[PDB]
Design a protein around this ligand. Sequence first.
Ligand SMILES: COc1cc(-c2cnn(C)c2)ccc1Nc1ncc2ccnc(-c3cnn(C)c3)c2n1
Length: 261
Amino acid sequence: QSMSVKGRIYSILKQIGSGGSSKVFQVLNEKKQIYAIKYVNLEEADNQTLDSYRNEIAYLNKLQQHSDKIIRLYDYEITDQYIYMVMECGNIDLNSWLKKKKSIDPWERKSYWKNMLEAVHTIHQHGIVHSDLKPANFLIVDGMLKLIDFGIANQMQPDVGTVNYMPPEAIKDMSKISPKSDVWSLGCILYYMTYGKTPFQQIINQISKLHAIIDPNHEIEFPDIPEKDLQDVLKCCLKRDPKQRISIPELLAHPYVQIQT
Ligand SMILES: COc1cc(-c2cnn(C)c2)ccc1Nc1ncc2ccnc(-c3cnn(C)c3)c2n1
């Protein structure tokens, strides 16, 4: 099977993922170049769902020039019945990669972190707060992480929504959501890449889990490691008071991401 986007024909190699009314396909152009095409069926979409998709496309388009840490969007076709997005094809999403890895190299960990910080920082510059960061939002493209989405349009699974990365300020006001909320979530991804688990993975009851995230009395454990800077980064990221939590610009000037070994 094949598909057409703005006159250009693409052969379907395989379907990478599915989620809701969305499907991602690995495809080839006439010159045998690989792309990932995202197909959205708008035949059952309401005006709330339509506006989410339009907002995500616009931001991905705007941010293209600003950073190479944002997944590339080469073309798109939009009608009343469907959406086609011609994007770069990555090797694997971060979540799938994390589940497969028995141990993460320290160097790989730092390089990925820098990519995450640069990607998130760029969105922040335009006034966008993701508020829903998790490993699945990142794609590995040639040993470089890139941000896939702004957590608005839809969630996809390779061919269940975790609360393990949720910042305290979100649960408290049930606005306090700020660029610092993303620091907590990025902090949780780094924590997982360091200790093999999210800061609150252990508590099974989701209500107890949510209560532990917002409780200063509940203390997050930070076992000692050879990278003292990494330990500091973690602790600065996972401060429950957003006002006391470190910022992305500050993180980019930290020893952990600027100084190796
Ligand atoms: C070979 O390509 C893949 C394989 C996997 C994969 C393979 N095994 N598992 C478990 C996941 C995930 C992403 C990709 N690549 C890829 N490239 C561009 C994309 C553009 C937009 N969205 C996705 C995406 C989002 N979620 N997923 C699973 C893929 C994209 N995924």
